[PDB]
Amino acid sequence: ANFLKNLHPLLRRDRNKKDNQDPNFALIDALNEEMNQVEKDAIESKLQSSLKTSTSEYLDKFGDWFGVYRKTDEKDDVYRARIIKYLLLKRGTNNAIIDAI
């Protein structure tokens, strides 16, 4: 969101008093809105690269990597908990069998 900072210095950054319908300010603020929205999305994209904070599609990618597939109507939190549990399954003892049952 450095669009106005790296813009050509002579161009106006502020809607001009002489005209409330200044098309230059309109175009600049439009482009600036798109730049800031893309920056916002790029910041929020970090949550998808972590198993802890992933959501639907990327969480499905993680569960496909781990071998665990989403059930019908299975939300993100229970699904990630089920993946984590599936990785940490004790096996080979009475207590493990009892828990599996």
């Binding site: 790296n6 210095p9 002579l10 161009l11 106006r12 200044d22 230059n24």
Partner: protein, 234 residues
């Protein structure tokens, strides 16, 4: 690839066309072979052409002459005045009008936030072409401080620092800086001082700028036909 195309003229013959283009009548058989013409090559009117439209051509029909033509190496004298205007317009480029409202940024030349886009009155963005384009670019370069523009250290001018004393030395510094700034433009063939004066505070000067001639711009644009870019990346 490009070829010449000839319109059949009244009571023309293939031998005359061959002499006109190839500089020898002997090519008329090659012209027939390339165009796939039957023996009455150039019929009098369309009634004869109805007998065999495929293999016959009438008056006003277009023939193809397979000679490799090229838009460069063409005598500028043949080119029409409107065609020359369009050619120089393409050479000097089209750009979005930002130097509208001359009075405002003339009242605040050194400051920022001085110029802005404008509309052409037809709901589309305003555009400056040819001489207006050159005016816009030269004004913008002179007004821009040097080094302030991103990705372009050398673009601009040092006039913002030349607000010095009232002596001939600073006048000469201004003049030299302005000549440097104008020379920096590739399209400016040369620039030179006309006259200057000092009125205490106020300095006044005027310059003469010779843009590239019509012939050079025509040659450049017609050369560009080989590439097809028809754009300016100077």
């Amino acid at each position: 690839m490009r070829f010449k195309k000839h319109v059949v003229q009244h009571e023309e013959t293939m031998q005359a066309i061959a002499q006109r283009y190839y500089g020898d009548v002997s090519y008329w058989i090659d012209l027939v072979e390339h165009n796939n013409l039957k023996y009455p090559y150039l019929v009098e009117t369309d009634e004869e052409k109805m007998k065999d439209p495929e293999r016959l051509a009438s008056t006003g029909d277009t023939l193809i002459i397979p000679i490799e033509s090229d838009l460069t190496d063409v005598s500028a004298k043949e080119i029409n005045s409107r065609d020359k205007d369009v050619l120089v317009e393409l050479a000097l480029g089209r750009d979005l009008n930002i130097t509208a409202d001359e009075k405002y940024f003339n009242e605040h030349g050194t400051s920022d936030n001085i110029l802005a886009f404008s509309t052409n009155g037809n709901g589309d963005l305003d555009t400056v072409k040819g001489i207006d384009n050159m005016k816009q670019q030269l004004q913008a370069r002179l007004l821009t401080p040097r080094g302030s523009l991103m990705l372009h250290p050398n673009y601009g001018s040092d006039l913002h620092n030349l607000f010095g004393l009232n002596i001939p030395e600073q006048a000469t510094l201004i003049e030299m800086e302005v000549l440097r700034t104008l020379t920096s433009d590739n399209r400016v063939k040369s620039a030179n001082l006309i006259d200057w004066k000092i009125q205490g505070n106020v300095y006044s000067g005027q310059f003469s700028v010779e843009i590239k001639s019509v012939e050079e711009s025509i040659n450049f644009v017609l050369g560009q036909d080989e590439e097809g870019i028809f754009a300016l990346f100077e």
